Design a protein around this nucleic acid. Structure first.
Ligand SMILES: [Mg+2]
Ligand SMILES: [Mg+2]
Ligand SMILES: [Mg+2]
Ligand SMILES: [Mg+2]
Ligand SMILES: [Mg+2]
Ligand SMILES: [Mg+2]
Ligand SMILES: [Mg+2]
Ligand SMILES: [Mg+2]
Ligand SMILES: [Mg+2]
Ligand SMILES: [Mg+2]
Ligand SMILES: [Mg+2]
Ligand SMILES: [Mg+2]
Ligand SMILES: [Mg+2]
Ligand SMILES: [Mg+2]
Ligand SMILES: [Mg+2]
Ligand SMILES: [Mg+2]
Ligand SMILES: [Mg+2]
Ligand SMILES: [Mg+2]
Ligand SMILES: [Mg+2]
Ligand SMILES: [Mg+2]
Ligand SMILES: [Mg+2]
Ligand SMILES: [Mg+2]
Ligand SMILES: [Mg+2]
Ligand SMILES: [Mg+2]
Ligand SMILES: [Mg+2]
Ligand SMILES: [Mg+2]
Ligand SMILES: [Mg+2]
Ligand SMILES: [Mg+2]
Ligand SMILES: [Mg+2]
Ligand SMILES: [Mg+2]
Ligand SMILES: [Mg+2]
Ligand SMILES: [Mg+2]
Ligand SMILES: [Mg+2]
Ligand SMILES: [Mg+2]
Ligand SMILES: [Mg+2]
Ligand SMILES: [Mg+2]
Ligand SMILES: [Mg+2]
Ligand SMILES: [Mg+2]
Ligand SMILES: [Mg+2]
Ligand SMILES: [Mg+2]
Ligand SMILES: [Mg+2]
Ligand SMILES: [Mg+2]
Ligand SMILES: [Mg+2]
Ligand SMILES: [Mg+2]
Ligand SMILES: [Mg+2]
Ligand SMILES: [Mg+2]
Ligand SMILES: [Mg+2]
Ligand SMILES: [Mg+2]
Ligand SMILES: [Mg+2]
Ligand SMILES: [Mg+2]
Ligand SMILES: [Mg+2]
Ligand SMILES: [Mg+2]
Ligand SMILES: [Mg+2]
Ligand SMILES: [Mg+2]
Ligand SMILES: [Mg+2]
Ligand SMILES: [Mg+2]
Lengths: 129, 115, 179
RNA sequence: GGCAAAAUAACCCUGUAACUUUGGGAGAAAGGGGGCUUUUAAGCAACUGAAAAGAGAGAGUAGCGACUGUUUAAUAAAAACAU
RNA sequence: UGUUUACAGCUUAAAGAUUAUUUUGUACAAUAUUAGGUAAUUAUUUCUAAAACUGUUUAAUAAUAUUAUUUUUAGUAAAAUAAGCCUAGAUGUUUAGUUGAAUUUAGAGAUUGUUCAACCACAUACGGGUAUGAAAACUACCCUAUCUUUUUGACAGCAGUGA
RNA sequence: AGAAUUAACAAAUGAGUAAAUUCUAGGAGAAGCUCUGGCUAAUACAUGUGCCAGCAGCCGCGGUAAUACAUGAGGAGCAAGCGUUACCCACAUUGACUGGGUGUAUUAAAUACAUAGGUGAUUACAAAUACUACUUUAAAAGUCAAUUAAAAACCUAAUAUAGUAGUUUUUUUGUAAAUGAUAAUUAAAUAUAAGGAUAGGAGAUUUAUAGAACAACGAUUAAAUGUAGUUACACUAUAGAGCUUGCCAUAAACUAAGGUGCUUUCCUAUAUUUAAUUAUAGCUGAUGUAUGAAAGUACGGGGAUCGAUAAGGAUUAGUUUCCCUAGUAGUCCGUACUGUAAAAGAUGAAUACUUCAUGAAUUAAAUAUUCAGGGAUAGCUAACGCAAAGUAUUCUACUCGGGGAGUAUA
RNA sequence: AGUAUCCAAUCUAGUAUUGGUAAUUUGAGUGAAGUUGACACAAGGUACUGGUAGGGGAACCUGUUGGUGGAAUA
């Protein structure tokens, strides 16, 4: 292995473009749709990226509705979608130019939803417990 | 492998020997011999059984030093040595030929003076 | 095989060792013809043959013999010289002498029949095996090593290992590993 | 159209690429030197030094023809002719 | 030409502690899609230079008549002789600060070499060089070079700012 | 939660601070996050959606009947954290000292000699070492099983190295007025489809000459193309050429492999047995040396047979091709290169020991055993299968999923 | 003081070696319900295939040696 220069060189990395880092930021050029393989059938959204390191890329959009367009700053997760080819990475929500998924109040951590003002009843003890 | 200082030039190959550390008197010599533990036999009994060119030699030296020094200077010791060792055999078989003429010239007089 | 190679490794440019002194082969060939012209077969002597007729002698004479028989005389001719005890046949001094008489034949066989590839591999073994007994005999009876190499026109080149691993190798010294 | 002119210019030494039919290319290119002294000087040299004269400019890359050669005396010496 | 057992401070020599420098062995990553490398190079001897000089006797040394001899460092901007040295992954290329040790682990081991500590290295530059001192260049000093603001300066010192 | 006091790091001087003490109120006044198909603890509950929208760590859900999507309820677990990503370790015998595998599971490279190196026979004797107990060095910090059941701490053990005592229950190194496995040599005997060379024989095929005045022969599932019509084919006789080496022939034949077979002689080589001799010189083995089917390449020669390419004939077919006629290169020898394969026993080399049957062979009152696969079994193995692929010991090498790929590049 | 030697930075040129970039060209993997034909696994309808040589709409065909990772014939 050549992209990898630490640890077990014999191990093929699980995110090659993203590399050693845990995340990396980029900018969209264009959005797309990609079909899955034959056992399934759907239209899963995809979002190109150029990274700061000048590397082309594709990425996944988990949220139902999305704010994505051209010239949007995005942050990558590295995980991926399974059925799709070339989509072994995935974007992160609640960051520079995405939006919290909407009309949603479950699994509020993956999608970036903050906690609503109803469920919370008390403040943190640094001010007015 | 190491290189060792023997003062008397006393040891040969099979002689098994203790060696000890000394400060370096030269490069690659920081050991000397202390003692032979087991000897190995010698080649002394067999070793005991075992001139005009000096005017040939001393010329051939002076030939090349006059030529070489003008043509190519000291610059490299490799040139200083690879020449000489390779030039003498080129010189000696020519300098032997200078003396072989002597046996020829002296007799061609006697052959002409006698008859 | 063994080459001039002072390091642990064995290169292409390194040259093989010398089997004979300069003009060692021809001197030995001359010795044979002297034997071939004035000798009889191995087992027989001239004293036993003097009553018998010439027709019996010329048959036993070694001119008419085969090279496989020409050696048998030369071998026993050597055994009487280079033995340690009576009826000695296998000691080191003799074993080297046997290969020297073969090399005289293999070369003649290989210079002539060049395509006998199996023979070309056989030289490399004789030399190597000669090169071993030639060393083991230095180590044990050095004053017999020289009394052989003169007769058979052999050079006195010691081994580069220095007889290190056969002789008195022991207690090999202590050091420590770290990091 | 750098045509013409200018410049290079012989000898000795160091050194010398791609390509190659392994002969060559190649004099490749590039650079240096030539006196007097007394001592071999970690000495001198007061425009110009084989003192005047004389003798190659070099490299990179396409097209045609293999090469030496031959030819239209008196406008064409070449990719033509021959081999 | 007051006293140096009145106090402080300084000089000189010796004994010893400690420190600086110099020396060796082994350990010490991949790679042959790198195998020949080295040329004052390898060994001895000599010469030169610095180390306080001369003598007396003794010891010891080789011959033996008893005279002569007795040491260490550096230099190829000293020379000669003989030809060797490394190649038992020399050289060359790439990567990298080494270690105690940290994470993990039943144990061996594997991956990393952050915090602190030891040693080495750097202090704008793989740069050149000097004085003092027991020991230096780290905010020393001189020169060149790069960049920058004042002919200063280089925050890999703390805090802090930008990117 | 709130408030207050003191000790100690300075019995002169504190920046700042008790994992210390007392007092009052009041009586948990600090909770989120993930999940709900299986691995995985938790619902066959409800609605809509309909291979769409979407989940997804891995398997995989969704096609009108969705405990897997979205809505809602209920329910489970971890907890000042919960969850996701990236890298590392363990679980893994997933990199093999402890501790693997290599006949068939993309793993022994074609093969042998051999260097460095590793490794290794008997007895007797010395010496040293291991093992046991004590002791030396290996900075502190950090780790560490600290112990009289004790937190804010100072395990002295392990490992390595030098050294002492005990020499008894291990091993190493080496020497002997030494013994003497193995490997080798000599003499004798025996065997070899092992290799090269010299000489000579044999076989069919083919050409030519001669003879004889026949008209068709040869190919094919069949047919045509094609050969001849004055004998060509065919038969007989004589000679010559290139190639090849019948029955013997078989598992129990040989050799490192490739591979090899008519007879005679010389040289070379291997193996079996006894006696004598030398007395571990042996076994293994990167670098390296040497060999290496066939096709193919250059030069030269030779040139009968078979026979790529291309041509023709046909057929069936619509093409190309499998069949047929004729036949170039080549096929054979010499000099040299080339250096690959399913290079095979798909099984690295060597030693010791080991089953029953069937069977091959010496031939033994000098000397007693060797061999085979065409059977099965112990034992081993995933199974098929092997008398080694079994039990035991010594050395070397390869192996970190697949595609990309035995390819690119240099 | 200073002459003369030794030496560094910067600059010039070409060569050697290694990387970056490009008109243009080419290869591979992957996805999908495509067209043409039928190579392969059975004797795959002419047994497959390795090494090699030549030929060639494609998958492929033929010679020469080898192997079974092929059946079948008593
Ligand atoms: Mg001009
Ligand atoms: Mg002019
Ligand atoms: Mg020239
Ligand atoms: Mg030339
Ligand atoms: Mg010139
Ligand atoms: Mg030119
Ligand atoms: Mg010039
Ligand atoms: Mg002039
Ligand atoms: Mg000229
Ligand atoms: Mg001219
Ligand atoms: Mg052109
Ligand atoms: Mg043209
Ligand atoms: Mg011309
Ligand atoms: Mg011309
Ligand atoms: Mg004319
Ligand atoms: Mg004219
Ligand atoms: Mg003209
Ligand atoms: Mg013409
Ligand atoms: Mg451990
Ligand atoms: Mg560090
Ligand atoms: Mg830090
Ligand atoms: Mg610090
Ligand atoms: Mg800085
Ligand atoms: Mg300091
Ligand atoms: Mg700072
Ligand atoms: Mg106090
Ligand atoms: Mg209370
Ligand atoms: Mg369950
Ligand atoms: Mg429903
Ligand atoms: Mg492991
Ligand atoms: Mg094999
Ligand atoms: Mg092998
Ligand atoms: Mg050995
Ligand atoms: Mg410690
Ligand atoms: Mg006829
Ligand atoms: Mg063979
Ligand atoms: Mg051939
Ligand atoms: Mg020919
Ligand atoms: Mg087989
Ligand atoms: Mg075979
Ligand atoms: Mg194999
Ligand atoms: Mg087993
Ligand atoms: Mg197995
Ligand atoms: Mg069986
Ligand atoms: Mg058997
Ligand atoms: Mg096996
Ligand atoms: Mg792969
Ligand atoms: Mg493959
Ligand atoms: Mg190939
Ligand atoms: Mg290749
Ligand atoms: Mg290129
Ligand atoms: Mg391009
Ligand atoms: Mg088919
Ligand atoms: Mg077929
Ligand atoms: Mg085709
Ligand atoms: Mg099959």
């Amino acid at each position: 292995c050549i992209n990898k220069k630490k640890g077990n060189l014999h191990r093929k990395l699980r995110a090659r473009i993203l590399g050693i880092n845990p995340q990396k930021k980029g900018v969209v050029m264009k959005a797309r749709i990609v079909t899955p393989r034959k056992p399934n059938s759907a239209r899963r959204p995809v979002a190109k990226v150029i990274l700061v390191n000048k590397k082309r890329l594709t990425a996944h959009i988990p949220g139902i509705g999305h704010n994505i367009r051209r010239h949007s700053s995005v942050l990558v997760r590295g995980g991926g979608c399974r059925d799709l080819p070339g989509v072994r990475y995935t974007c992160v929500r609640g960051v520079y130019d995405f939006s919290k998924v909407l009309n949603r109040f479950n699994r509020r951590s993956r999608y970036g939803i903050p906690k609503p003002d109803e469920e919370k009843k008390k403040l943190r003890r640094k001010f007015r417990v | 492998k190491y290189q060792v200082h023997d003062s008397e030039n006393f040891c040969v190959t099979g002689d098994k020997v203790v060696i000890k550390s000394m400060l370096p008197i030269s490069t690659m010599k920081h050991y000397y011999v202390r003692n032979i533990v087991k000897p190995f036999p010698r080649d002394t009994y067999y070793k005991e059984g075992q001139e005009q060119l000096k005017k040939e030699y001393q010329r051939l030296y002076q030939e090349f030093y006059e030529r070489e020094q003008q043509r190519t200077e000291i610059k490299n010791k490799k040139d200083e040595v690879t020449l000489k060792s390779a030039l003498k055999a080129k010189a000696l078989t020519r300098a032997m030929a200078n003396l072989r003429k002597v046996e020829s010239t002296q007799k061609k007089k006697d052959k002409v003076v006698a008859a | 095989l063994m080459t001039m190679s002072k390091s642990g490794r064995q290169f292409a440019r390194d040259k093989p060792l010398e089997e004979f002194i300069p003009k060692g082969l021809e001197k030995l060939k001359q010795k044979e013809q002297v034997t071939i012209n004035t000798n009889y077969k191995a087992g027989f002597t001239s004293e036993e043959l003097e009553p018998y007729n010439e027709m019996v002698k010329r048959a036993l004479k070694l001119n008419n013999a085969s090279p496989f028989e020409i050696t048998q005389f030369k071998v026993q001719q050597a055994i009487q010289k280079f033995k340690v005890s009576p009826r000695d046949t296998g000691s080191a001094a003799i074993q080297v002498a046997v290969r020297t008489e073969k090399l005289i034949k293999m070369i003649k066989h290989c210079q002539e029949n060049r395509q006998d590839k199996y023979a070309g591999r056989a030289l490399v073994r004789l030399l190597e095996q000669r090169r071993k007994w030639l060393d083991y005999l230095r180590f044990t009876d050095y004053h017999r090593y020289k009394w052989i190499c003169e007769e058979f026109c052999i050079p006195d080149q010691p081994p580069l290992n220095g007889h290190h691993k056969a002789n008195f190798r022991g207690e090999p010294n202590r050091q420590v590993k770290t990091i």
